[PDB]
Amino acid sequence: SVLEMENGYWWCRRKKHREGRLLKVGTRGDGTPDERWCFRVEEVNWAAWEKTLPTLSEDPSGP
Amino acid sequence: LEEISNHQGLTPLKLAAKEGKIEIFRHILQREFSGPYQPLSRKFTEWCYGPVRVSLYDLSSVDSWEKNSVLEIIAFHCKSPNRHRMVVLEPLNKL
Amino acid sequence: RFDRDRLFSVVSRGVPEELTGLLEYLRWNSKYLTDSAYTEGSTGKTCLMKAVLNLQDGVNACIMPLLQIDKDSGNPKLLVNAQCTDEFYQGHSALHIAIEKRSLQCVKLLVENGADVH
Secondary structure (H helix, E strand, O other): OHHHHOOOOOOOOOOOOOOOEEEEOOOOOOOOOOEEEEEEEEEEOOOOOOOOOOOOOOOOOOO | OOOOOOOOOOOHHHHHHHOOOOHHHHHHHOOOOOOOOOOOOOOOOOEEEOOEEEEEEEOOOOOOOOOOOHHHHHHHHOOOOOHHHHHHOOOOOOO | OOOHHHHHHHHHHOOHHHHOOHHHHHHHOOOOOOOOOOOEOOOOEOHHHHHHHOOEOOEOOOHHHHHHHHHHHOOOOOOOOOOOOOOOOOOOOHHHHHHHOOOHHHHHHHHHOOOOOO
16 A cells, blocks of 8 residues: 555656665775665664674764 | 676565565575675664664665565565565564 | 864874874863864764774773873863763763773773762
C-alpha cells in the first residue's frame, strides 16, 4: 500500500523525494569523499561495552 | 563489483531480493567490517553512548526513489513464499 | 599566533610538542581559554572535551599539559568544570565523557586537579 501511494494518482504525478540524509562516511571509498544516502536506526544494547570500533562522529546529536 | 548489472538489469543485492534468497539478502543488507576494509560496508555506526548506539544503515538502491528498488522488487516482482520475511527484517522494517 | 582550529588539530592527535606558545599567546591577547571564541562551534564544546573524546589505548598525553596551561593562564573559571550548555546537551562536564569512555586513568587524572564530581 505504501509503495502504491508513493506513486500518486493517475492524474497527478507526485514528485517522490529521497529518503534519509547524506553523511560522508569514508575517506577513500570512491574519491577523496564518498557520500551515501543513509538512514539511522537507534538501538539500546545492555550487553556490549566495547569502545573499540571507531564511530563516524563524537557528540551524539540526535535527529 | 556490487553496483554491476547482468542482462536482466539486476545487481546481486536486488537479485537476492527477486529470487527469494533471504539468507544472503540479510547479510548483504547488514554488513559491518572493521579495519582497513571499511568502504565496502553498509551498517556504519554513527555514535554510541553507554548502551545506546545510532547506526546509519545504507540505502543505495533500497529506497523507492530509484526505478528498480529492492522495495519494489520484494513487493511486485518476487514470486516466493519468502516475500514477507524480507519485509520484516531491518532496515526495511524501520524504512 | 595560535588559531582555534590549529589548537584543535593539535589536541586531536594527542601531540603535546606543539603546545609551546599557548601561555604567551593567551597572556598576550588578554583572553581566556574558556572564551566563546575557543568554544568548538555552537554546541558549546570546550577544548578538553575534544581532548577526551579521542583517546589512544585509553589514555591521552595532551590532557595534563593543557591543564598546566590553564593553571598558568590564571582563569577565574576553571577549565575542567566547564559544561556544554546548549539545548540538546546541556551541563555536560568533561568528567562525564571519561566515565562514558571507560577510561579510569582519564577520570583519575581529571579529578586530580579539581574536577567537580557532582
